[PDB]
């Protein structure tokens, strides 16, 4: 009785951070020891549960949230963080019990001239609640004058493209992130 970890980490295409995808995993034995021992994963950090002592633990359900950001933003996928991703795209609660795994995906998600497939929310009037998912494309009204669906001064599109390039700095290269939560 194994798990779909194979098709979640080694998936062909990931989702944008603003439209983060969630896979549900309930009752299947897994070996998180081959992942902690892997140099492929640039980030393996767990909260509320030790990353070493992980295989013994048992919880009723496991959620696998996956998305793509850039390297400088991987520090925001943690409880009590602030920034573009944490405030407007993906917020982890303070009492989050799980792990955050990330690896550099430059060879897959970067294109010469810039990739147009991965977006991130740039404007929002209020911060996201923990595990909230916002995919609305409403024109952000930054001023008092109401936008009527048309962009302009103080009327901007809420989503922006990363424009991933292979020549970008490693801080700006694409990173695929997988967030495991245990309830």
């Amino acid at each position, epitope marked *: 009785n194994l798990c779909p970890f194979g098709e979640v980490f080694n998936a062909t*295409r990931f989702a944008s951070v603003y439209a983060w995808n969630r896979k549900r995993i309930s009752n299947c034995v897994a070996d998180y020891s081959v992942l902690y021992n892997s140099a492929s994963f640039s980030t393996f950090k767990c909260y509320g549960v030790s990353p070493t002592k992980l295989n013994d633990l048992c919880f009723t359900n496991v959620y696998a949230d996956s998305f793509v950001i850039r390297g400088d933003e991987v520090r925001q996928i943690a409880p009590g963080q602030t920034g573009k991703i944490a405030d407007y795209n993906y917020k982890l609660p303070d009492d989050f019990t799980g792990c955050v795994i990330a690896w550099n995906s430059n060879n897959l998600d970067s*294109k010469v*001239g810039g990739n*147009y*497939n991965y*977006l991130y929310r740039l404007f929002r009037k209020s911060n996201l609640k923990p595990f909230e998912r916002d995919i609305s494309t409403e024109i952000y009204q930054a001023g008092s004058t109401p936008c009527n669906g048309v962009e302009g001064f103080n009327c901007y*599109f809420p*989503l922006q*493209s990363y*424009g991933f390039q292979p020549t970008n700095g490693v801080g700006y290269q694409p990173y695929r992130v997988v967030v495991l939560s245990f309830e």
Partner: antibody, heavy 127, light 108 residues
Framework: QVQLVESGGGVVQPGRSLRLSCAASGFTFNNYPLHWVRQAPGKGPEWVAVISQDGGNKYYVDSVKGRFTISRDNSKNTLYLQMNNLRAEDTALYYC????????????????????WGQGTTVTVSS | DIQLTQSPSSVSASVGDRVTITCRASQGISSWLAWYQQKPGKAPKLLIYAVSSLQSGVPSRFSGSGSGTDFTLTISSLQPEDFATYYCQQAKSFPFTFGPGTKVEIKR
């Protein structure tokens, strides 16, 4: 009308040089990177070189690396390909083409293909 | 250096037929593939870019699909001005490589 017209081809001995030009009109020249594509008789197209909008980035196929030099004059709306130390396998019809700029969330993304092609200019490397 | 293979090498179709051409890449190239149409003595003509984005002016009978290594160009109802050689081009990294092309021939 959006139009690319290349010129400067002809017959040349091996090892000698040739300079191709590309005259553009109908679009803002400096907002588009530009490609050079060649096509040998009976064969399919082969991408040769590209230059960015301002001329800061240049990329070449390994077959022409070190022998060809792409350049552009934004004030004259003209693209150039400087071909040195020519070989027989350089014989082909040479087109200049405009980069396909994909716009997503009002951001430009470059190097996505070629949408506007010229009529081609013929070079023939023979003794 | 990303290679591209097309299948079949030739197709013998008639007016109204549904023609499908495939393009296989040696590595995953996401949604960065374009399709070109070329007639003898003419420069290539861009039909589709980004797998499934119809270039302006191209009739809607042309369509495209695919992701990663396998891509498809479909002509729903073939019209007389569609008999030509079709190429697939990837745009993940330089050099921009083309496919070997598939010639659409008149069946008789």
């Amino acid at each position: 009308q959006v139009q690319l017209v290349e010129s400067g081809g002809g017959v040349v001995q091996p090892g000698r040089s040739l300079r191709l030009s590309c005259a553009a009109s109908g679009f803002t020249f400096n907002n588009y990177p530009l490609h050079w594509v060649r096509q040998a008789p009976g064969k399919g197209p082969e991408w040769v070189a590209v230059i960015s909008q301002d001329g800061g980035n240049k990329y070449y196929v390994d077959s022409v690396k070190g022998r060809f030099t792409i350049s552009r004059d934004n004030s004259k709306n003209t693209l150039y390909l400087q071909m040195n130390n020519l070989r027989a396998e350089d014989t082909a019809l040479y087109y200049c083409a405009r980069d396909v700029v994909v716009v997503v969330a009002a951001r430009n993304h470059y190097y996505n293909g070629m949408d506007v092609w010229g009529q081609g200019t013929t070079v023939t490397v023979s003794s | 250096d990303i290679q591209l293979t097309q299948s079949p090498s030739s197709v013998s179709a008639s007016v109204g037929d549904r023609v499908t051409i495939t393009c296989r890449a040696s590595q995953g190239i996401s949604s960065w593939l374009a399709w070109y149409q070329q007639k003898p003595g003419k420069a290539p003509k861009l039909l589709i870019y980004a797998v499934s984005s119809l270039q302006s002016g191209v009739p809607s009978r042309f369509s495209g699909s695919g992701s990663g290594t396998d891509f498809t160009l479909t002509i729903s109802s073939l019209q007389p001005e569609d008999f030509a050689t079709y190429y697939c081009q990837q745009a993940k990294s330089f050099p921009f490589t083309f496919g070997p092309g598939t010639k659409v021939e008149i069946k008789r």
